[PDB]
Amino acid sequence: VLVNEILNH
Hints:
By secondary structure, the protein is an all-alpha fold. It is 44% helix and 0% strand. It has one helix at 4-7. The radius of gyration is 5 Å and the shape is elongated.
């Protein structure tokens, strides 16, 4: 939840 939001999919 500190990077996932980005690569999120």
